[PDB]
Amino acid sequence: YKAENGNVKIPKHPKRVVVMADGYYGYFKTLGINVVGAPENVFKNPYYKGKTNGVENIGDGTSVEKVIDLNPDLIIVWTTQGADIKKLEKIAPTVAVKYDKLDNIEQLKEFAKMTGTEDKAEKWLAKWDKKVAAAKTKIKKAVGDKTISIMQTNGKDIYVFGKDFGRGGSIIYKDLGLQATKLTKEKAIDQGPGYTSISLEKLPDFAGDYIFAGPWQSGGDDGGVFESSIWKNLNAVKNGHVYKMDPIGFYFTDPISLEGQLEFITESLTKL
Numbered sequence: 448y449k450a451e452n453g454n455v456k457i458p459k460h461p462k463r464v465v466v467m468a469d470g471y472y473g474y475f476k477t478l479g480i481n482v483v484g485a486p487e488n489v490f491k492n493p494y495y496k497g498k499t500n501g502v503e504n505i506g507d508g509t510s511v512e513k514v515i516d517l518n519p520d521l522i523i524v525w526t527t528q529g530a531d532i533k534k535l536e537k538i539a540p541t542v543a544v545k546y547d548k549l550d551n552i553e554q555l556k557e558f559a560k561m562t563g564t565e566d567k568a569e570k571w572l573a574k575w576d577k578k579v580a581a582a583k584t585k586i587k588k589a590v591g592d593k594t595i596s597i598m599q600t601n602g603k604d605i606y607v608f609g610k611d612f613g614r615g616g617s618i619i620y621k622d623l624g625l626q627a628t629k630l631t632k633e634k635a636i637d638q639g640p641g642y643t644s645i646s647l648e649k650l651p652d653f654a655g656d657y658i659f660a661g662p663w664q665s666g667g668d669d670g671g672v673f674e675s676s677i678w679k680n681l682n683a684v685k686n687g688h689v690y691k692m693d694p695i696g697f698y699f700t701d702p703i704s705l706e707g708q709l710e711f712i713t714e715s716l717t718k719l
Contacts (some may be wrong), residue, residue: 457521457542465514466484466485467470468524471487474701480574483517484502488507494696494699494708496704513571524545526543575702583622583624595716599662601664606644607642608635613700614659616713623712630652660692665694690711
C-alpha cells in the first residue's frame with residue numbers, strides 16, 4: 448500500500464513478516480501477524496521473551512543475508528533503522544515506517560489497516576480502554592492528586608520524562624491523567640520534545656511525591672545519582688515512593704508491553 452518509501456504493494460493477510468523495527472514487534476504479535484524474525488532487544492524485553500517467541504529468529508538488524516534465509520513475504524522496518532531501505536526491497540515488499548510519525552495507540556490501528564485484521568485490533572482497544580478505567584480509579588483513590596514523575600539516569604545527566612517520549616509516560620500522564628510537578632509539565636510536557644535533561648542540581652524541582660526512576664540502559668554504572676546525597680535527601684525517596692524501572696522492558700510501547708507497563712504502574716501505586 449502507501450508508504451513513506453514509495454507505494455510498495457503489500458500482500459494482504461501475510462504469513463511471514465520480518466519486523467526489523469524492534470519496537471513494533473509487540474504490535475504484530477498482538478494483531479495476529481506471524482513474525483519470522485526480530486532484532487536483539489525483542490528477546491531481551493521481559494514482557495516479550497518472558498512469554499513469547501515461539502518461532503522467531505534474531506539478528507541485530509544489519510546482516511541483510513539472515514533476512515533472506517528466513518524467506519519472508521513482508522519486510523517492515525523503521526525509516527531511520529539503519530539498514531539500506533533499497534537492498535531489503537530486493538527480498539520482499541519493504542514498508543518503511545517513520546518513527547513517531549503516528550501516535551502510539553493509533554500506530555497499532557495503522558498496522559491493522561496495512562494488514563487486514565481490524566477486528567482483532569478493535570478487540571484490544573476495548574480491553575485497553577477498560578483496564579485504564581479500573582486503573583485510573585484505583586490509582587486516584589490511592590494517590591489522590593499527588594505528583595508522579597518518570598525519570599531515567601545517564602551518567603551525571605538525568606532525563607525527567609513527560610508524556611511524549613515513552614517510559615510509561617503515555618500511561619502516567621495521558622491514560623491516567625496524573626499530575627506532575629509544575630516544572631516537569633512546564634518543560635517536559637507543555638513544550639519539550641518529550642524529555643528534559645538535567646543534573647544533580649536541578650532535581651528538587653522535578654522529584655514529585657512518587658518516582659519511577661531507573662537507569663538509561665541495562666547493565667552499567669548508575670552515574671552515582673541514585674547513590675548520591677541529594678537524591679536520598681528528597682521527600683519522595685524517603686517515604687519510599689520510588690520504584691525502579693527495567694529499561695529493556697520500559698523501552699517499548701507496543702500493546703503487550705503496555706499492559707505489563709500499566710500493570711506495573713498500578714501495583715506500584717496501590718500497595719500498602
